[PDB]
Amino acid sequence: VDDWICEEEITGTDALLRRMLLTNNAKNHSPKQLQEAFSAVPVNNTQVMQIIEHLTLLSASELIPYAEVLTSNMSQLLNSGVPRRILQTVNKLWMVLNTVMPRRLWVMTVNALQPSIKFVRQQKYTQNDLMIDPLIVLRCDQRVHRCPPLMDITLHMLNGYLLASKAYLSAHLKETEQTREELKNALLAAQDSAAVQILLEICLPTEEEKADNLLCNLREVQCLICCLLHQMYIADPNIAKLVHFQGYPCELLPLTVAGIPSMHICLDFIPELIAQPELEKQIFAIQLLSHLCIQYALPKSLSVARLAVNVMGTLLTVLTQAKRYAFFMPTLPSLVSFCRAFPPLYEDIMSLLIQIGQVCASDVATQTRDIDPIITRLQQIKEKGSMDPDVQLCHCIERTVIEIINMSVS
Amino acid sequence: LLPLAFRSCLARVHAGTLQPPFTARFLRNLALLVGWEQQGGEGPAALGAHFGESASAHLSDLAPLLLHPEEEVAEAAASLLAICPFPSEALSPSQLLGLVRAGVHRFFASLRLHGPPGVASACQLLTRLSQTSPAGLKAVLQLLVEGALHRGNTELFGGQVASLLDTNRRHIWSVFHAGVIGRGLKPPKFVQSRNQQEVIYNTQSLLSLLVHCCSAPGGECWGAPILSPEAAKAVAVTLVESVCPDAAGAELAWPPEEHARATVERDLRIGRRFREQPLLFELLKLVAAAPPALCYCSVLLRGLLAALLGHWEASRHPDTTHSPWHLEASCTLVAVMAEGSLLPPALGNMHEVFSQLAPFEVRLLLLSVWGFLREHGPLPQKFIFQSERGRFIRDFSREGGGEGGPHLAVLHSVLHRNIDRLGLFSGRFQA
Amino acid sequence: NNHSWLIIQADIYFATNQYSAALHYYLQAGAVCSDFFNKAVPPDVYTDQVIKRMIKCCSLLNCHTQVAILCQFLREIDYKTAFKSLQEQNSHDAMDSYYDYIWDVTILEYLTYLHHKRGETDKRQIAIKAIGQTELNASNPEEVLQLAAQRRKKKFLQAMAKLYF
Amino acid sequence: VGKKVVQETGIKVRSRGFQVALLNKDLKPQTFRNAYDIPRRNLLDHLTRMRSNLLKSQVHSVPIAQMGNYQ
Amino acid sequence: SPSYSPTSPSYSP
Amino acid sequence: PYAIKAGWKENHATFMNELKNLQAEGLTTLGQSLRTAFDLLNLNRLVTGIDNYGQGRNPFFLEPAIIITITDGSKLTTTSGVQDELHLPLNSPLPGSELTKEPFRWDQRLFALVLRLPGTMSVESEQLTGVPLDDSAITPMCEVTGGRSYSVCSPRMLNQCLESLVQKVQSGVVINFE
Amino acid sequence: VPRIWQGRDQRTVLRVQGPELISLVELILAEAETRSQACSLIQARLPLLLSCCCGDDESVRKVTEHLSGCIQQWGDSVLGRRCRDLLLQLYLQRPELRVPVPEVLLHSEGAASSSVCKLDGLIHRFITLLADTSDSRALENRGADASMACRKLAVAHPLLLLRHLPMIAALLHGRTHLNFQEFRQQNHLSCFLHVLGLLELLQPHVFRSEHQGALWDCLLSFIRLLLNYRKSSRHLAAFINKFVQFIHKYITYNAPAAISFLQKHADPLHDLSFDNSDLVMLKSLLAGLLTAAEMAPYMKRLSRGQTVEDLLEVLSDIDEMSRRRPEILSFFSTNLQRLMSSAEECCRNLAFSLALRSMQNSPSIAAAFLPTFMYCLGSQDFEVVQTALRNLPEYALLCQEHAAVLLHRAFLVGMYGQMDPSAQISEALRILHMEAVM
């Protein structure tokens, strides 16, 4: 629907500017001239700027000749120090070309956005090639991951090829008939979930970005991917359920919960996600529920939080020492979020925290340790270590209680 | 005035008020006052303050400050604890345990931080705590060695110890490989590095503290002190508890070699513990300095000897130096057994020749050691207390066959076979 | 360091339902009588009455596995209280960590059954590993079992001392 | 004498009837048939395998008794 | 109902 | 419901498969299991009328069976506690059970193979003597029903006991003499 | 930028360094200065400052002290005026800072501005809880806790409460008509004495011009109550004493406003004086139109007492008369702090109750009891720790700046010592959260 609603008249000012500026007979700007402007030894951003700015005025029908030069040279736009307006206008022109010339534009655009270290890199990514394996479009040069216009382009491509692949393999299984439908549905669900996971991993800050600065290209790409995932979840919430059952790196949970308004449906299946055997899935469920409770503080959210507290208290006395550490290290920062969402949980949260603190203290007492936290019973506050698991878990319990008390007190 | 003042100041210290600079200043000033009063001039007598008693009243309150995150407060409290007198009556078991645990933690923490120089205060505190009572002595020794052998602080003494996106990048249209075996590639493996000089002098500091805690007080103007067999026995038994589980075959009498073949797993565990932690041998010879105590390490010595016997049997090299650690461990083990009077001087000198022999010869000598210990045994009752100097002495002449007839025959045969290289060492095994 | 007065203080705390303080002072008396807990505690101090008092102290603090340990101290092991306490699930002490200190094979048998019935397979594996220890084989020579029990007793009492002092 | 059933996977979770099941013993996860049985650890590889299998283009886990019965 | 937030007005028919 | 896993109408392969996959995870509920075993053996007696009740006892109408109970020496346990004395429960009697007023029947015997293998090896020259009787709770129940218990303390003693057991299987009935 | 916020739904965040923030706030002040030749633009620009500070307590405190220095520099210039306006707006937006801010803003009239405080709704919640009560003793306990929190906020942040003065004035207006019998049974006298004490504890600021109208409304409600139930004036002896002391302070600090109120309501006062002539203090007012020495032997006996009998006797003598004269307990603070750590149960409990009552009357001295209370929590004597836990919610409600470390100590002793303080910490934390951020 994005391409169709793009065609919709907004105000008609574009027609006015068409009739006014294009009448200058500056239409001497030709694809060969644009290609020459791109291939200057210096960057020479002025000439390409003027040409593509002029091309914005061109109607979609006559803009077809410029498809080859714009797509072929968009790899050069990844270089450092390219002006933003160049990429913005390229995005606008690509959207226009997509509105009138979708399929071959997609084929040539994917062929153009190859990593380029492999040079040709199998330029035979035909229409069928992408239609069978939509994830090819994600196999692109790393620089697009922090280039918001071309990233938006790639997201459009990815959505289109997911739907195209669905219809394609449906048609293929129909014609090859001469059960398999279950395998079709499973393959489609797996493909959509895999696309979602790759996008989420793109949203992660890399090590260099890890090496504050909340306004950058990464935030723009995160917003774009969040919008696309919102569209996908609206299209099929079962994909959201499958992705969350698969889980993903918990650093994204604030980002994903804040940027995907359809995420509120997660409270429906979180009770069933909790009941999975895998410890990792339960940990992820607790973290997800904590972020949602921060976001949406609803009675159903409170009931699911009560269930979360009860299961954490339950399997506190089912897990071994190593399992206790591995489970309660990530899910303890969720308790402060639960306290923030729901004051009526203070009783159960504090009772659970006391029980786990005494269990961990006894566990510390069983074996000789380095720090011996029990004798350090009168320590002060310490805001922000390869020690043994139990003292780490005790310090984590301490920090959880510190955060809860500090936020409630102020 | 002084009890109330100390109470109020410590209460302010424990509460959020009285920030760490003033806390360290207060502790240093109180330490200065206690040390000044101990220096019995005219002024301390005239003042009549009794800083020592009032400070002693709040020992349970001062003990947590040894664990303070601020280093200056920690060392100020360490000095104050080092000099402050304990209560006239005694220390309560909770107070004694808290003081010992805080003292050993401060000892190891300051050893890690400042090295050996910044250790004197904790050492003085622990020596005093050991001197308070035998229970205090046992607690200090046990906790100190346990913290020394703990996975943390063992490095002080030379001890040992994007997915989906990248996957899509790598991925022509077939999986080729059927799957990944286990959890993918193994990690980049563990590495370690520390100056050996620092290891040596940290071990020296720990061993000096242990010798201070073990040696009896007082006295006379001449004569080196005697290591207490009770303290060394405590160190021995806690070493046995730490290294191995003390599970089976724990009686001091050694069993036949059939049992050595029947308990190879425990022996290998003991051997690996000795290989990873060089500090264990130092503690072994510390135990061996006192004669009766090394008998209680009979399980440790038996297991290590069994591991070495297995290694020498399995060894295929012609020279014994291709196995550096095992050769050194055999030499050290025999020397330690000789120090504790578990072997006669003739057997005790065999480690001098281990570096020259083939593996089967050194295995035969160690098996002769095993046979001798089967015949006589490391029984503490065999040690006769020589009241002439307050020390236990093992008499092998009275024991009968103390020279070890068959064992010396085996040793002489081994020497005679390799007489070309071992001619000069023939005198070390004379009667 | 007068163990009789420490036991009197512990009983005074126990009479007022101050179970934590009572257990603290019982452990202090035990620490007085033995050289810390290196030696075995004399029978006339840790009598069956004192050990039962410690049992009830641990039970009222929801340290149920600790009750399971102390049940072995008695002249005859009180399997009824130990089994009734291990059935609890609101434990405040690290249940799996204390399975090293059981030396009686029937206590561990009940433990393995309980974990199997409730489905916690991993703790059942820990219990089965504990049973499978060679030193705990019930048909060992008597002094071997006695020494294993003694060392586990020492380690457990030292852990309790570190926890409560 | 047959009793072809296994132990209940429940937990009897307490509010101190929702329960968390144990490991699905003998489940035989139909990874190709169901997309929820694919771990994130190996999502892409199984995706490729099921894609290739679906086009025109559990085994080798036989019991030990039936492993070398050549007859 | 993923297209409507839980704190949005409900269209009662 | 799960105690019996190889009853009647079960082939040898099923027996072997069940025997391999045994997990030691229950209580030492010796009495209830022994009652289950005796009820299983006496399941078919009344329907075929082998026990001629009220018509004398026929030694030629016998279905010879022996129960070889292999167990350790540890005391009996139940969820309530340790029982420390073997008691057969009679909570749900099989129909017609009161006619014999004893679970074990005329042609049945119970041989206990009490495993007492020590953890650490203890070589003893006393092992060369004959297999001794065990002191556990199962020994009186073995004695009353014509059988006897065995206390093996080494693999060779286990082999000797199993050799003795094979010689002790023979079709016959047990009579108390006076 | 719309790209940064694309996909958001605009419902319920950047970091900058110190000197950059100082430059930004000085730039805001320059904009205000050139705008001067109201506070509209300062409030318009303030969201940027809050976003840039990112809720960083240290950054906000740095800006606060920098603006205080600027106000000290300029004094009362146009730049000084706009610095005061910005500082008061920031204080309203970030009132969680324990500092009540210096006297410079206590003289300004920006409290009536069209501005929203980050804490106003919460004190509104607590003042509703204070006023609304019934015969229930549970609701009376709730109202007492509400009075405690509101009083601590009064002594800590007096300006915030005075912005809500017309509200409680209207409530006082509403509650005055009800006859004496239902007034006493419904415990409305508790509400009246609570608001009267609160007004007393908002002493030097309630007499300003902006607060004058609601103050006159509250006083009108009080005098209407006095006139309507003049028959049973004897049961209102404490209320009459408190009201006359408040009138004394009113005529002392602000004589013109007090006189202007008195002439506005002269005839009710004259009629009440003629009818209730036994109000000798009222007649003394018409005419206008020691304590430490008594407690010497008590303090000496308490200090020098050793046996439990003597301590119990002196504590009971202090307790029995302190109900009549609550002000006296301020003298025995340091002396009975040492009794709170006493091993004996009875004297310790009685000392804890007396200390709690003392700091209840005077919330300022509550912070002085922090070291002894923390020592009691951490002491070896388990009875002492138990009773410290028992009184933990009350003292936590009293302090509220060291409630963080206090509850942390309580949790730590619960974690290692086997006691279960989950209930006490839960109640204390519930009240503190229901005050500070809810």
Numbering used by the authors:
A (entry chain b): 724 to 901, 922 to 954, 984 to 1156, 1177 to 1202
B (entry chain e): 549 to 709, 726 to 735, 745 to 791, 796 to 1008
C (entry chain h): 831 to 995
D (entry chain f): 474 to 489, 526 to 566, 578 to 591
E (entry chain Y): 1619 to 1631
F (entry chain f): 59 to 236
G (entry chain a): 1704 to 1715, 1724 to 1748, 1754 to 2005, 2042 to 2190
Which sentences from the paper describe this structure?
The second reconstruction corresponds to an Integrator–PP2A–SOSS–CTD post-termination complex and contains cryo-EM density for part of the Pol II CTD and Integrator–PP2A, including the N-terminal region of the flexible subunit INTS3 and the SOSS factors. We refined the post-termination complex reconstruction to 3.7 Å and used focused classification to improve the resolution of various parts, allowing us to build an atomic model. The N-terminal region of INTS3 (residues 35–500) was resolved bound to the INTS7 N-terminal region. In particular, INTS3 α2, α4 and α6 bind to INTS7 α1, α4 and α7. The SOSS factors NABP2 and INIP bind to INTS3, as observed in the reported crystal structure. Comparison with our pre-termination structure shows that the presence of INTS3 and SOSS factors is incompatible with Pol II binding. This suggests that INTS3 binds to the open conformation of Integrator and blocks the rebinding of Pol II to Integrator after termination. The post-termination structure shows that the INTS3 N-terminal region binds to INTS7 in the open conformation of Integrator and prevents the rebinding of Pol II to Integrator after termination. Third, Pol II dissociates from Integrator and its rebinding is prevented by INTS3 and the associated SOSS factors, which bind to the INTS7 surface and sterically prevent the formation of a complex with Pol II.
